[PDB]
Amino acid sequence: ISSLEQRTLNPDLFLYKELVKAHLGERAASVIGMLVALGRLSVRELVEKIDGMDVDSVKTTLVSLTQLRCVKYLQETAISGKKTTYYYYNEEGIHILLYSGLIIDEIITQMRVNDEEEHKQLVAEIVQNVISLGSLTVEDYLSSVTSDSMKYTISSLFVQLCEMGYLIQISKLHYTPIEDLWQFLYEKHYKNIPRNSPLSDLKKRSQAKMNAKTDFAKIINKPNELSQILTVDPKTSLRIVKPTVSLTINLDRFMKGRRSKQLINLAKTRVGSVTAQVYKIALRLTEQKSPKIRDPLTQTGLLQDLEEAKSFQDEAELVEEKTPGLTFNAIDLARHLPAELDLRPHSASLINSHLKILASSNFPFLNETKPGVYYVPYSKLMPVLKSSVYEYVIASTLGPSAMRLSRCIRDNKLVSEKIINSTALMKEKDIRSTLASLIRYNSVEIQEVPRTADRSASRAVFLFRCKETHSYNFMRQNLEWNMANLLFKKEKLKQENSTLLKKANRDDVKGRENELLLPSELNQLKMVNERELNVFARLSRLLSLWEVFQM
Amino acid sequence: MFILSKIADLVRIPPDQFHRDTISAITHQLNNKFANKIIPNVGLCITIYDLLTVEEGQLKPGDGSSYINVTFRAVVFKPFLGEIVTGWISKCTAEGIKVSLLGIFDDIFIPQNMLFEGCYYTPEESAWIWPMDEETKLYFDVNEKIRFRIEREVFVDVKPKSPKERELEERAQLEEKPPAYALLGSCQTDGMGLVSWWE
Amino acid sequence: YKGEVLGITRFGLSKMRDSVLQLASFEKTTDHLFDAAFYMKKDAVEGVSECIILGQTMSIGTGSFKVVKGTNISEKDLVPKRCLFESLSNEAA
Amino acid sequence: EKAIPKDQRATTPYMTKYERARILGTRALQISMNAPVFVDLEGETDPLRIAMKELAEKKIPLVIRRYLPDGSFEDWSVEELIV
Amino acid sequence: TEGRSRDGGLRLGEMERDCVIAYGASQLLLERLMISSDAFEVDVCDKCGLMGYSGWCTTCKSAENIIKMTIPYAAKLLFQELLSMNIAPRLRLEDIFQQ
Amino acid sequence: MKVLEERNAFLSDYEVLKFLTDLEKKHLPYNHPELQGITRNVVNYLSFAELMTKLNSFKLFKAEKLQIVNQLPANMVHLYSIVEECDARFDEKTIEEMLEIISG
Amino acid sequence: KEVVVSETPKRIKGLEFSALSAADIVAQSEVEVSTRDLFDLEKDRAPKANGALDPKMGVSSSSLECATCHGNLASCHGHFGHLKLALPVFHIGYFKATIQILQGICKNCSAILLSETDKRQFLHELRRPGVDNLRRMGILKKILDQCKKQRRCLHCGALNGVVKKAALKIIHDTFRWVGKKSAPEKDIWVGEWKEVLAHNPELERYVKRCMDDLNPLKTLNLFKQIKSADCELLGIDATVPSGRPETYIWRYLPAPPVCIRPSVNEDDLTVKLTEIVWTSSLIKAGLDKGISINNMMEHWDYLQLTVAMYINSDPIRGFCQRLKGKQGRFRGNLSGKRVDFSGRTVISPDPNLSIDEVAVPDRVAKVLTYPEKVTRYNRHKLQELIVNGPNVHPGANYLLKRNEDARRNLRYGDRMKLAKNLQIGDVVERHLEDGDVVLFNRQPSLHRLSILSHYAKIRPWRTFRLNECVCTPYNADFDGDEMNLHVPQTEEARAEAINLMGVKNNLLTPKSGEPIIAATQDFITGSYLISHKDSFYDRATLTQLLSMMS
Ligand SMILES: [Zn+2]
Ligand SMILES: [Zn+2]
Ligand SMILES: [Zn+2]
Description:
This is part of a larger assembly, with 1 copy of chain A (about 550 residues), 1 copy of chain B (about 200 residues), 2 copies of chain C, 1 copy of chain D (about 80 residues), 1 copy of chain E (about 100 residues) and 1 copy of chain F (about 100 residues). Chain A contains 24 helices and 9 strands. Chain A is mostly helical and about 550 residues long. Chain E has helices at about 15-20, 25-35, 75-80, and strands spanning about 10-15, 40-45, 50, 65-70, 90-95. Chain E is globular. Chain E has 3 helices and 5 strands; from the N terminus they run E-H-H-E-E-E-H-E. Helices cover about 25% and strands about 30% of the residues of chain E. In chain E, strand 2 and strand 3 (about 50) form a beta hairpin. Chain E starts with 9 loop residues before the first strand and ends with a strand. Chain F has 7 helices and 2 strands. The longest helix of chain F is centred in the N-terminal third of the chain and has 14 residues, at about 15-25. The relative contact order of chain F is 0.11. Chains E and G meet through strand 1, helix 1, helix 2, strand 4 and helix 3 of E and strand 2, helix 1, strand 9, helix 9 and helix 10 of G. Strand 1 of chain E pairs antiparallel with strand 10 (about 335-340) of chain G. The complex binds zinc ion (3 copies). One zinc ion binds near residues 106, 155 and 156 of chain G. Chain D: It is found in: Cytoplasm; Nucleus. Chain D: Belongs to the archaeal Rpo6/eukaryotic RPB6 RNA polymerase subunit family.
């Protein structure tokens, strides 16, 4: 009765096999199950691993998974000359299946600042089939609509929404792995050397590297460059979309807007209540030009040495305060500050009054270079954002006393139990219990001393570290397993009530005032689709906690 | 109703039965295996109709009995969708009716939605009554020639329980099982039900 | 026959015998079958050491062949039967 | 798929002594399970020595499936082999 | 059992096994080692490869694909001592007869 | 055990009754507790070369055609019960024309 | 009514080896062993439920019965249980291979410490058709010593030293490859000692020995993040759901069946299982009442010590000690084993019986039987053996009917009644007769001719009498040594023994194709003394001498 078979699954294999078995069929899950469980795979390798589908029925799925961006392939060859495609998986093609209810209700809430209209029903409908078809142009969607009063309306909001982000065209860089896109680009700048060049080999290595570093950042921003918007007034409507491009959705602008949703939630518990609203519009303006939640240059390798991580932290702190969009003052907020703020009329001097208070808090919300020019730090706040929410998931679940030790161990950072009860104020068996229920998770390690020759625990005192990444990666996937378990029990419940749901779709297409049935099962259907909507409620609640540690 | 089915199988001929003709020696073993027995998911076999292909008899190092791979055809009671079938009424239960078929296949059930228009059960005499007309109340009596159309066959995959559970129910039995294969008969249209209404 | 001089000691049989239970009766310690479980090896039951461990007949000597009892059908009565409803239904459709 | 037609049977026409022991051990196993014998047994009861009689007059109704290491198999009747 | 002052049992061990392999006598070796020393009718499972009781598999609660085989009891005793050491000898079975 | 195809062909019940009468002559000891009982209970339960032509000339469908020669309709409503769309798919005058085929 | 049941005779084609999951151990379990109380002493020392020796796990006596299959000691197959360990411990058999994958992962984010360009190069070397066992173990070493070469990760900026042993501890030193460089890991390292060493400098003497330890509560949690696209690059192949590397840490422990460890006197394994349970109880109750970290580790190193003694114990026998030695399983129960229908007797000479015969004592022939299955041809013969019964030699000890699956003992009852009712398929066990195939060896069995096959001959003394020309392959003489007679029991095993192992067919050694059964020491002398040049015989002496040999 207790799900113990699922306690032994790889929680990303158990997740990714469930985000496609519910949405796609049970054949797409079998393919992408092997791609997670075996890495890179050919087609002639998948037909030897699956054993239950032949060489063409897997090719039915491969041309459909790439439609939904769930496969990030590569078409490369050996030295003999046979071009063998090694299909991979990608997570962001699966996360759009995971965030799929949040993406629609984000673009609804972001498109309430441009038109007071039913676009919250209408722009939700256009984004509903940019995801369910993955890649599409505009005119095939314009082919299905007939009324030009609405056809011009949807074509207007296409270029309006794509103006401020959320949609870019598809490319091969969307379907090629970043670490293999990097090394081929790294080898463009290696064989371009003069033959028998007198440069030393470490400098020969660095000549290939920093030439490719700005070259790698160039290729990523090529879809971020707005060349798709270039269809300028052929008869009217000074900017519209390009028809011949296949227009997809990006996630790096959504997650960036999703990160900004987290930071206003941190601010509501530390720095006032009305001034956090001022903080909300502040980050909402300087939003699209913000750096990503995760540099794709990190996952290309490049951390074999110590200095390139320092080189990454050079440009990471560079962009948060030396970007022409990301430098703002208290003057610019009132241009987009709406009405009904009621900060007791609004004026930029009182804005700078409540912009000063977002500097003096211990959390680096808004530091400043110039006294009017404020900016939000990202390399300094995001490694303390996740440290704050991790302390309260421990506090909510393991009691509030477990929060006390998890910070007392954090600053003292090699503390022992003789020093705990000096710097804590509980009874010692209560200390030795709530610490014991906290080593079971990776929130603390234990640092032993070998007082004797061997590392004996008889006469030895133990010390207590608090590692960041071991405590986080465990909490990252304790949620990710719980996120996947919850969809497993969703799908198992819908599949055992299949003869109800088949009757609920066929006999009563319209006649649901009586169901053309008995009232002894519509109440039973009521407690199915309530739990079927309550499970996605707990999904979105959990997904906000999970996405913190993704950054 | 009666169809044939190409079935491949591995038979065991004990070596005392080598004196027979090898055609009749195979079919005797096949009739031991298939007569009066539900083939899973195709219905009730009756006899073995012919033989199509035998191999050469292969032997284990265990015993001397030869093992022949044989493919054959057998008669099998599989009535198709919507077929007018007769029978003889066994008992009128409260929720439906079960009708015998002269010991061949007695697991027939006709539910409420498969009866006539307005049939009600009488617990005082265990009989179904249908109010036909001004002369309303007709009689679904017991052990007479019935006429009814089947609707759907069912394949109850019977499943043996655990030996700790198989023995505890056997222990308390000393002081019903689900039929593996059954039919959903119906009396929707006129002409159905009793044959005496239309003989 | 593996290209080098192997020898009939413990390393030479490991080159020869890719199996687990044949080398297990060779050994005097026990960790030859823990990395059989770790690296998840999957051996056949072909060699005569593990044939008699698992109790099934080795394939040398009298197990080298198979004995078959020939049937005396000779395609005589393996003509199929009538089924003259298909002669009826050919005229139907 | 796999078979060898009896005009291109490559192997030996002589009965291997390992074949002779399983043929007599099989046929004696059948005879002890009440199988009918084909030789005029002169009042003997033991199922081995009856089976040795049948191999002398070549009256033993078995064939031998000589498997080849590729997967093929030749079939040789026991009255065809040379003992 | 062991010894002389019991009922008895004469050990056939590791060196006469070698002798009857050299004769090629394969059913004697099957009989003298398994059939008349320790024969054991056991119930394997076909999808798991583990041994079930009473025609019933335990690691998959079904009597469905249980096969009944004869095996040396010392090989049964071996497998249940390997499952306790946390290795799993999973028997992979197949049919004896070509189709 | 494998069933290769579930329905090789249909069987008109005269073929089955002709088969099992030959089985009773062939099996007259050969006592089966299961076979000999059920092959007796099916032949009393079930209780041709000229009728196999005129039904096929009517262009009725072979699925429901077999039940005409399996059990014989003693009434017009039973003949209505076999063929679906008896009044709509074809005319009325040939329906009683099939009735003397039943008596013949 | 009833379903067509079918069965095919099958055959083992392979063994597959893997560890079990925590879900595979529970799925085969019948009880969860939770108490150390073997017996409740108030109910006459009966085996207490949910402890060890619980009757759902099997039975040790033939009087009591099991609680799962309800079979006695003869027919119970034995049933497992399991045993949930709080604070998991390292498996002692996989402890070498727990090391070899900690030498292969990041130890911060637990990603593999390899680049991609050689990774897909390595996977081509392993997925190729030319892979053998030690070939793959050679590649898996070739990709492990290469993995110990790289000093940082590709996924995070952590640096990684070496990881090795310490008994049952695993120790990572992050440093020893920093030299003088690699500041920020060392900076937070030497920064955090100043919170302690500036308080109590007694621990300053032990700073060079304090390294980053890897206890099984965080070695387990480090294994749960290896993201199994590269477990096959650790030699795992994680397509199987028990592939995953954290299945090699003892979270759950199977309690073996009571058939594996009986009670004659508790067993060595039964007393080890309770000790493991007791330690787990001390640990689980200690984690909630509040115990110190100094004695939590003292118990949890002791719990790991017991399970280490449970498998190896290297003076009690573990499980590995039951499998090792020439008295253990592999040579002592699987290759060699005491057999039935055998006898052992002093040998003795007999020139009068043929070279293919052996003289069996008629006291052994009364106890060594043959399962003669009755037919048409020996129906009258076996009826005479029934009525003679077990105590005269042309006789029989048992009778096993066609269906009654229990041997009627001919010592009791009316034997004339059972002889008229002798069917055509039921087995008598008749006494060893003249001409039965027997086996016969000397032990020490040096060569192939050291076990041969004869025809029995039934004689009135108490000793085996082979011919003297046959004592050369056994390499024996008549000085008090003994031989071993084996009576085969099946018609196939009786016919392979007389035809392949017969004396007349084995008259030559296979070593060189030379005669090995020929005239012995005293049959060469009497033969030389006849064919000596001056022996002359008349008709009276000659024809008497020709009648000696005939
Ligand atoms: Zn199983
Ligand atoms: Zn039991
Ligand atoms: Zn790393």
